[PDB]
Structure formats: structure tokens, C-alpha cells
Design an enzyme around this catalytic site. Sequence first.
Site, PDB file in Angstrom:
ATOM      1  N   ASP A   1     -14.980  57.385  34.587  1.00 56.64           N
ATOM      2  CA  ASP A   1     -13.552  57.168  34.338  1.00 56.64           C
ATOM      3  C   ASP A   1     -12.599  57.466  35.504  1.00 56.64           C
ATOM      4  OD1 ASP A   1     -10.945  57.227  33.128  1.00 56.64           O
ATOM      5  OD2 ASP A   1     -11.133  59.414  32.548  1.00 56.64           O
TER       6      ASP A   1
ATOM      7  N   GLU B   1      -9.642  51.000  29.302  1.00 53.20           N
ATOM      8  CA  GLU B   1      -9.330  52.055  28.816  1.00 53.20           C
ATOM      9  C   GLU B   1      -9.482  52.200  27.319  1.00 53.20           C
ATOM     10  OE1 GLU B   1      -6.345  54.093  31.379  1.00 53.20           O
ATOM     11  OE2 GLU B   1      -7.800  54.986  32.142  1.00 53.20           O
TER      12      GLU B   1
END
Lengths: 159, 161, 7, 594
Positions: free
Chosen positions: D14, D177
Site C-alpha cells: 500500500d 484503494e
Amino acid sequence: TLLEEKVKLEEQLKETVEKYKRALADTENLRQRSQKLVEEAKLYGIQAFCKDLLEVADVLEKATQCVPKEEIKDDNPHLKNLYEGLVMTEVQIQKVFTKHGLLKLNPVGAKFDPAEHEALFHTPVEGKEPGTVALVSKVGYKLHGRTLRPALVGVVKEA
Amino acid sequence: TLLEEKVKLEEQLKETVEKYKRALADTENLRQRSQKLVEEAKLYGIQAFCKDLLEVADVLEKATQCVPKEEIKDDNPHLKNLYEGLVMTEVQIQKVFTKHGLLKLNPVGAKFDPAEHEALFHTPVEGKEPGTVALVSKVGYKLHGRTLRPALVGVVKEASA
Amino acid sequence: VLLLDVT
Amino acid sequence: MASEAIKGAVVGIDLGTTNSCVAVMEGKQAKVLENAEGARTTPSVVAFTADGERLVGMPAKRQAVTNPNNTFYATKRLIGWRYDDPEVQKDIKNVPFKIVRASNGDAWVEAHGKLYSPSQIGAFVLMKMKETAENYLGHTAKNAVITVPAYFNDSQRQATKDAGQISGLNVLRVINEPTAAALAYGLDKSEDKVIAVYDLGGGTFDISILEIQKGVFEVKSTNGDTFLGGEDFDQALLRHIVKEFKRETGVDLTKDNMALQRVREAAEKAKCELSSSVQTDINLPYLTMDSSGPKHLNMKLTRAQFEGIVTDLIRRTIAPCQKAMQDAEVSKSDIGEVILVGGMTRMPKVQQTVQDLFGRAPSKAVNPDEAVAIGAAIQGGVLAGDVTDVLLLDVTPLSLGIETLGGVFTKLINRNTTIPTKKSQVFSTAADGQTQVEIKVCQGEREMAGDNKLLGQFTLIGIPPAPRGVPQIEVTFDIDANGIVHVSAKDKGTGREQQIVIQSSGGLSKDDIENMVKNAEKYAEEDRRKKERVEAVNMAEGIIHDTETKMEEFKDQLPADECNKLKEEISKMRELLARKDSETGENIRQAASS
């Protein structure tokens, strides 16, 4: 001839698939054992840390308590500021202990419990049940529901 | 269709055999990684407790240095006993810290090492070699090579001239 | 007739 | 092409603007890896030194003060954007480090007279993450699934792919996301729905309306506030605390430096505490030093006060969400579920706002701090690993074992064990001269033989005579797949084996998994106590039998009247009041010497 190929391939498929499931099921048990080992190591380390951390709290509590509450007056500013700082530090220590599992043990008037309470002495006391904590000489502590240090208390006897 | 079906099923057999080889590799790797992680959780593992007690230790140090050290006499006996109790608590917590590898970082004159020192100002200081610590605004703490709190130091800068 | 456990 | 044969490890990195996180698939559930310092989130700061270095992370945040012109931070706002862009033109003024135009007219950064693209900074952060993943895993992590903001166009996604390729990572797919958050929450295997993701708590607020038709995720709309994040809430609480301290005493902490950091940490702790309790206490002894004496801060803060301090920040998330609903052409009734992501979504006021705004109760089952990383790890594991194979691997419903001479229930296999397993354990005879050995197989969780269940019984007949403890019997369970448990008892050394195909291995699959385990935990200390008592009785009787056998061997000139501790041992045996007989087991005296 060629029919034996189907039987051999089916038998090999069954054996190899069972062996593959055996291989993929042993790694899961090994991973679970690894997680259990890591948990136990962490718990023992934290218990070792707590057994040494208790003494700091004991010393600070005794030092603050030994000062009577009568003499803390505005005509003695140096003692008042120090007493306020010390009591705030004590409650901060207790807050941090409680956050990470280390709980105090002050069973004022609670029933006797060998798991967490230790009878320093036996003496009958009026107005209290037999086998009941009349006084606490030393405070005890607990970790995750398991008594790390039993509380030294006085047990009311029968007169 | 029989021959092609047999060929496809034999190919699946070879594929699952190589999958079994990968499974053996995976379980061996898991064994090695578990052996490493148990050691990591044994050396460290009190990191949260230490990171939370750092502030209690700093407060006790500030309390020890707070009293003007001139009013601690026999005229004020209860201030004397309280101060000695506080000093005993300070030394006890410092003995408890170093028993578990918690070493303070007080680099008054060491080289500026970003892995353990959090720079706060780049003030130019005369008479001191560039790249060192002019002063330590707060003592750091570390255990077993794993820093818990950088020592908030102030580096020095070369002269503008 | 009751099996034991090896220590 | 055919099967790519990835056969490697897939990690979900991430890559955030300020913080980053890397996760791996530990079998059936994803796991977030901690870096060298023990912190789960690696700062995405790349700092360069005078001669040459590549300090990344906290070793780069710490050094930033001495090196402000070579500390590149929050560079994910420059990725894929040309030099002549409004956003880059607003950003260049504020950032201390130099921003220069590339040959292709792209916004790059400069360090010691060297050109660095915004993709290369992400590449360095990815290199730090791959180093962390290699430190944990042990081997090389080559394949990765990186996450990008849902509004990342094709050029910026290509830039992220280039950054992942530069760092030596095989970027399978670049994920969104909200898609990663949905995967982490578990909506991949879901019917047609319209879900909205609520991302509040980072450096930006994003709300995206997702659709799960056919099993694929299509982002209908996206919206949110750029200048709103989790730092503003902390700053508001800190301003309130310092203002109240100045009001109460008269010293302003803005001039201070260490006191301000202490207050900031206390404010963060109180804010993280004002989500499960109504009130909180902020104690900072010896906060400031003054001529009249030290001053100690002591403030009580109630949930209503905090909700009133930051109610404007929460209310600023109302218009972008409504416009996201309008653009996506859906209403409060068409939304099937709300997904909470971000560190500040645990505050009950924020969840109340979301419920009032979508008409649905938000799902708070996955840690919003680490939802994107875990979702990326799950998607990567599905994409190239073999995890669904472990998913279909059934587990044992409840523990199995055999009986013991003293009534104990030996645990050969525990409760939550994968079905295709084999385990063995050696056992000895009951007593001297015994030739008949019976095995009682039962299923349960309590530490008792017949207090749980009884699957079946078989007897292994025929043992050569031998003293107690010498014969060895291998009781091995051969439970194969599909819950077919092949309990077998093997007599080591000789023949006469036994084997059973006991059925009902979890056939009664019901709430028994959770309700025979609920009462087993409450009845644990007493069960352990009685098991210890019976074990004490067993070793006491074994010791007394050994002592009697040794006494009946030597009789001449043996004045063993003082050696009558067997009587007191028996008397203690018939006493259900003592803790244990282990301390009383000192009855192995052999002064006669055979």
C-alpha cells in the site's frame, strides 16, 4: 495393455492427491504451533518485565503515602508541588499498568482468596466476617487473570 | 478422446507433483521463519511496555532535578524523605530498565547518527566539529539494537563565514 | 485393561 | 498465454502519500509485516545526504531538520503529472525541495544536481518495503500488487507500474484503494450490490461508490476533501488543550518545544481513547517550569466536548459524499453496504454521520488503518498464489484422543487441526504382567475420559509378559481427508495390530463447535484441578506399588517399621481436600539396596 494405463494413472492420481493434501495440512499445523510459540514467548517476556516493574510502583507508593496529608499547606510550597507531581506519576504508572494488563489488587473487605490473597497474619476483628480481608499490608497485582504477585493481607479469625 | 484425456490427466499429475514439491519448500521455509520469529519475540516483545514507561522515567528524572537542592535540609524533614523516596524510585527504575537491555542514549559528543538521533535544530556552534551533537534536549532509549525513542539532539552547522 | 501414558 | 507459473510470493504494498504498508498472505488470513523498528507503517520519506545515501523512512524523517532541501516527502502528489499543471504549480511553492521540469515536460525533483522522477522516489520506498518483506519471509518477494488512488488515470497507473518495475518487483496488477478495501472486508464473493467506501483519517478524505456486479468491482463515482485529514483533528485537540492550560494557569505552551510534544502525544492518546469510553483524563506532570514553581496539567475531557471541537471537520465530509451519490446516480436506498477506511472512522460520531448520510449501518469488522494492505494481500494471493486450496481444506470440529489408566484424556490431536493429518504417540502397559490392552477413543474438549463423548472402543489382545513400563504400544491416528478418521493401535516389537474406521467424525455439524467450547472454558480451572488430583493419585499409587515390590523382595534383617510411610500415603490418598500428593511422594527409599 492400454487399459492398464488408466488404472495406473488413476491410482497414482489418488495417491499423489492424498499426499499433497497431507503436505498442505502439515504446514497449517506447523504455522499454528509457530503462532502459539510466539505468543508464549511474548507472554513470558512481558511477565518478566512486570515482575521487575512492580517494585518501582511499590517504592513510589510508599514514599508518597509516608507523607501525612496534614502538612501539605500553601506555606510549604516545595512539598505541595512534589506531592502533586508524585501522585500524578503514581496514577500515570497505574494507568499504564492497567492498559497492558497489569491490574492492581486491593480487596478491601473482600472474601479471602488463596489465588490472589496471602494471609500475613490471623487476628479476629469485630464487625468483619471470618476469613475476610480486614487490612492489606502489601498490594498485589494480576496479569491477564493470572495472579503475578499475591496480595499480603490480614485475615479475621474467630474469637 | 481417450488418449488426449490420458495425456491431460498425466499432465495434471505432473503439475500436482510439482505442487507437492512447492509445498515441501513452503513448510521448510515456515519452519525456518518460525525459528527466527520466536527469537525475535523473545529478545523484543516488551516494546509497548517500555515505550509506555519511557515517559514515567522522564517524569521521575524531571522531578529529581526539579527541587532546588538547597531546601532539602533537616528544617523541612518531610521534603527530605519525599525527595529521597523519589530518588530511590529513579534509581530503581533505571536498574529495572537496564536489566532488560533498555539502554539510554545520551550522545553528548557523538557523531549525528540519524538512525538513533532526531535532529531538532541545525544551529552553528563554534569550537565544535560539524556533524556532532551540540546538546541533548531529551535522552533517548533503545533495547537490543531496536531504538524506541530517538534522543532529541541538536546538531551543529559549519560556519557561514 | 486401561492404557497408561509414557512420561 | 498459458499458465504464467508465478510460483512465488505475492505482497500487497500500500504505497501512500505519507505512510505505507506491506502485507503478505499467511495461509487463510492476511498478515501485516512490521519493519526493522517494529512499526507496521513505514513513512514514505526518501532523504539524500551530502556524499550519497538513500535514507528511507524514520531514518529520513529524523534527519529532515538538518537536511530540509534534500528530504523528499509526499511525492505521490507529483506522480504522472506534467510540470505545467495547476496542482503541481500550487504544490511547488510550499515544498522546500526543488522541483524541476524533465526533458518530456514532467514534474521531477532534484537532489545534489541529480534528476529524480516522482516514480523513482516511489521505487525507493518500494525497495524498502521489498527489503522488509524479504527480512520477514526469508526468500525473495518478486511479485507484488500495488494500490493506487481510485482517481489515478492511465498515465499515473503506468507510472506506478514503472516504479514497481524499477524496484525489482513483478507488478501483477495495480489495484484501487476502494477495491482493496472491499476485498479486505470480504465483498469479492458477493451478489450484485452498490457499496460506498468511507476513507477518512489519512492525508485526504475519499468517498467512492462501488458496484459488485458479476463479481467484479466498477467504481461508479469518487469524491472527497483534499485539505481534510487526521492531522487537523489532532491539531484542533492540541489547540483546545493549550488554550485551556493557558486559561487555567497562564503559561502558553506554544513557546515551549518539549511540552508541546508531550501535549501532542497526550492528545493523540486521549483521542484514541475517546472512541470506547465517554470521558478521558489527560495527566502531564511537570509539564512546564516556571519561576513560582512547576506546573502540572490535569484536564478531564468528555466525548461531547471533543465532538463539539471537531464537528466542523466531520460536517465538511457531508457535501462531497452527497455529490458522489448524485454523480453515481444512486440514492440512500440503492446502497447495499458502507465500508469504513481510515484511522478516525472509529469515532462513534463519524459512524453516526455515515449512517445518517447513507441510511445504512457501516461495517466495522476490519481494522480501517490496515484495510488497503490486507485487501491487496488477499487479491495478490488469489491472483497468483494457491490460497483457495487451503480454503477448502476442512478442519477437525473437535479434539480427539484416547483414554488413560488414571482416567485422563490424552490429547493426540487438538480441536482446530486440519483434517488430512497423521499423528502417533507411544504408550506403555497398565501394570506388571498385563497382557490385555484396551483402547477407548472419544471426542471432546474437557480433560476427562467419559465426560465429553465416546466414539467407540476396541481391544488390542496379546502382549508378551514384561514389567510395567517396558512394553511400547504406538497408538496412531490416520485421519485422512473428508473426515475419515482411521484410528489404529500398533504394538511395537510384535504383531497383533488393531484398526477401526470410526464414523461420525463431525457428522453432526451444528453450533456444537461454539457451544461445547463455550462451557469448556468456564469449566477449565476445576477440570485442571481434578486432572492434577487424579495424576497425583496415579503417581502416588505407582510409587507405593514400587515401594511394596521392593519391600517384598528383601525381608531378612529388614527393620522397616520406621519405613511405614505407605500408611500415611494411603491415608492422604483417601482425602479429597489436599492440593496434590507430589510433595508427599518422597517414598522411594531403597536403603535395603535390593
